[PDB]
Ligand binder design. Sequence first.
Ligand code: NAG
Ligand code: NAG
Ligand code: NAG
Ligand code: NAG
Ligand code: NAG
Ligand code: NAG
Ligand code: NAG
Lengths: 330, 49, 49, 99, 50, 50, 216, 39, 49
Amino acid sequence: TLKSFTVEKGIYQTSNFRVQPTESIVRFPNITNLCPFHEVFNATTFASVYAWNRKRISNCVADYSVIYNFAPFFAFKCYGVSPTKLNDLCFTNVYADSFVIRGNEVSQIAPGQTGNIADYNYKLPDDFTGCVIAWNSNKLDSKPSGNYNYLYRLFRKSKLKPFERDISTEIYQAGNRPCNGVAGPNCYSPLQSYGFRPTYGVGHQPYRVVVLSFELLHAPATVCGPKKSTNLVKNKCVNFNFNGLTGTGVLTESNKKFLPFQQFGRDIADTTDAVRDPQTLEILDITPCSFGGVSVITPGTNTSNQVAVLYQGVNCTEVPVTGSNVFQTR
Amino acid sequence: TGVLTESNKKFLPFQQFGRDIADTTDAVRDPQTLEILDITPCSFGGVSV
Amino acid sequence: ALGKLQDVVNHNAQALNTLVKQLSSKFGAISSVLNDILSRLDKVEAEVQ
Amino acid sequence: ALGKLQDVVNHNAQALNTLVKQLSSKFGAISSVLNDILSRLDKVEAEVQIDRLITGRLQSLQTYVTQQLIRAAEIRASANLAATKMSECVLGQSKRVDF
Amino acid sequence: STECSNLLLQYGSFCTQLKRALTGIAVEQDKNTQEVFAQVKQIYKTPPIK
Amino acid sequence: STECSNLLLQYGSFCTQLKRALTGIAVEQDKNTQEVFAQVKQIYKTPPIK
Amino acid sequence: SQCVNLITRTQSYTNSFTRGVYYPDKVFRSSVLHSTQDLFLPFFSNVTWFHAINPALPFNDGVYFASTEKSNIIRGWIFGTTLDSKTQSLLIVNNATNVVIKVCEFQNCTFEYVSQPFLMKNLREFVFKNIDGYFKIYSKHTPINLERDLPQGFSALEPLVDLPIGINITRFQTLLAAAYYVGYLQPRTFLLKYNENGTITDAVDCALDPLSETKC
Amino acid sequence: AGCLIGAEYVNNSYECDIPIGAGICASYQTQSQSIIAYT
Amino acid sequence: AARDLICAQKFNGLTVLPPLLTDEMIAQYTSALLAGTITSGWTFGAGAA
Ligand SMILES: *[C@@H]1O[C@H](CO)[C@@H](O)[C@H](O)[C@H]1NC(C)=O
Ligand SMILES: *[C@@H]1O[C@H](CO)[C@@H](O)[C@H](O)[C@H]1NC(C)=O
Ligand SMILES: *[C@@H]1O[C@H](CO)[C@@H](O)[C@H](O)[C@H]1NC(C)=O
Ligand SMILES: *[C@@H]1O[C@H](CO)[C@@H](O)[C@H](O)[C@H]1NC(C)=O
Ligand SMILES: *[C@@H]1O[C@H](CO)[C@@H](O)[C@H](O)[C@H]1NC(C)=O
Ligand SMILES: *[C@@H]1O[C@H](CO)[C@@H](O)[C@H](O)[C@H]1NC(C)=O
Ligand SMILES: *[C@@H]1O[C@H](CO)[C@@H](O)[C@H](O)[C@H]1NC(C)=O
């Protein structure tokens, strides 16, 4: 610590001692169902972008490594998470939105974007967490005469809110004379059709987009991936994994008055003090394991090589997990 | 955001902007009518209780 | 003879003048003007700058 | 009457309380909890967010220690005055006016 | 700028402690002037004879 | 956290000089108390007559 | 039949008396002063006391609702931009014994949800909010003596339900002898106080007066 | 130092209770209690 | 047209607070100390003049 080969007489702060964790436990809710990602990704017909579908996914075990075998996409583009860490932690609810756009507008399916799809068809929030999966569908959504089954909206009086749908078909008022349901000068239909042909370029080919939106933990968790649970152990320094919340500490029984809608308890420094066990509805206090500073009292190295050790702020009965002369100071 | 008043700043014909010591725009030339306008921040201060 | 009080005045003037002049620095960004950064880029890149 | 020693206690309480309360800040990251960052992201992105948190907490700690050094200098000046007053007021008789 | 304020709100309590330090300096200056000059308890004046 | 410690090791010796400054302050406080109060070489006591 | 049956509405105006506080999150906190920025009913605000012995009621940034009667009248609230069929609308009708939250998105159904807990000399305070396509309902049931005007005190509102509806909720209308208080939420910052048991016992509205701004 | 709203200026002189600015202080007095400002 | 540095300091968020004691009050304190020193000696610093 001193970066020297000789030590003068005095007391020196060297390091810290820390009680190492012994066991590791995982506490996940008991859920046996499997999430239907196959019914979302494998479908004959996909919805239009102005009338995008939304499927709720809850109360099932989600395996995110089987998505790669369902659709031929390059990358699993995510924003708040990573694709390789989706199987470990877990959420409250999953929302799957599926639609068909062109290759120009794939860049507009992103938080904080401005364009046609982002302003009038499908808007993502600024604090969006989740993943976007887009892949080419030129062999399924395109015909050499011209597919007209996919629509998009570009005439509206205001920009869309995030996760807001608009399926109304009323004639847009672009001038002063009222339309009265009849198109004409300064009166246009708000929905126009795509013109997908297989002889088109790669930037104008149809693309199927599925957006997975995750709800982070505020409620008891309903969608959790394949990790086996472990028996709960108390009054011991262990590693714990409560619904994807990892940590190290000692779990003790609690007398905190948790309200029935409350699952977590936080500190002043924004760390978890109490947890609710998902299998048995119990409240557990978490405390850090025993630690403190270590000081080394020595004379000079030209005098002696004998040392004394001062463990700071900890009692004399808790220091392990001459030198037989244990003394208790303040 | 600010207040625009008529200015007596002697802009050269090639100059279209004016700056401060802290690199903020102080004067501007209107692109339609060739007129110099100052830019002053709106009224502000501190409140003590 | 009164150079100490003049130094007291001059140091307090120079600190505020340096604090004003420091607003013109880029600090590795593309511009020292905040509105130009907000106008040029979208949300993520302007948030970085 | 004893407001000076009360201020001495209160400043050392307030500095430590601010140092603890600065641990809840994000400093431009996605979260203030280190384990949530290490669990949500892969290695490179969590390294970026951990670097942001490290820079913010290091800046807070350096600010605390600089304020402590200035306060220690002021306390040492007051202790020198108290030692001079003990040497000249208690151990003898002083002719200095208002000392 | 509202965006700059919203990103500045994530940096903690730096502004409050800088404000506290400046307020302490400002109070300390008036304390220094009071402890130097206000050493007398009554406002004496010279008689008109000189 | 081991990853945070391995990233913090790349920032040099800020922690060591931070600890050195705090240790110097801690020694200076005891020096202040000793130089104020410990000014007499022998512990005198009052006689029992009052 | 459909009829009209326009029960005549007379507007009376009263004062809020520091009511309409809810838990901003589901995190336990004890003996902590916590500052929250959310949609809250402002303190000492102007709320409307409708009597019913009905054009529309505007909806903006959430609505606080208060009911005193036990005579089994107030059933639900119809939400949406239009009334019957022009755009998306909402229907949260409810009955007595098996309390349904039977909520609909026909006008073409895209959202259906049925659940039990919504409704159970007593105030039944509710808060309805719509943010980012999510519809949130909080509620609290409390007693009263001297039932005229709103009480003086603090009673926090516990959450009930969150739904992913994603519609435009410009207008709303109560489904009906009856009298109810309607107040409007604004984006505000409060300073809430959590006692030793973790319950909100006091709060400070930071934009009411300079004294509370100093307190915040 | 600016101006003051809610305090009534008096033509008296007391010791400084709450400091405001260039020679101006404020206090809270019974003589109906109110907040007054003075030099 | 002559922009001052104090205007930029005010517009960029830096303000200077006035002192509690004006120069007239400091001059009155100095005059009281001088009158006491001349007309009474060192007695006024120990009690009644
Ligand atoms: C998609 O689902 C249908 C319905 O079960 C099934 O018949 C079909 O084989 C699936 N597609 C693929 C590529 O397996
Ligand atoms: C999950 O565990 C709890 C307690 O161990 C039990 O009451 C519940 O029935 C279990 N659920 C299932 C689906 O087995
Ligand atoms: C701590 O030490 C004291 C005296 O050394 C002892 O009385 C007390 O029981 C100890 N605390 C424990 C063992 O928890
Ligand atoms: C633009 O407006 C100015 C002022 O009215 C006018 O002098 C100028 O000719 C206009 N430019 C064109 C191209 O019409
Ligand atoms: C509420 O608004 C009405 C509108 O005329 C007004 O008469 C009444 O005094 C207001 N209530 C207040 C300010 O408490
Ligand atoms: C509802 O539609 C109106 C236009 O009629 C629009 O101004 C408003 O922003 C919309 N509200 C939401 C929440 O989308
Ligand atoms: C907490 O609850 C207990 C039991 O209900 C009660 O005795 C105690 O007074 C409460 N604490 C408060 C109200 O601060």
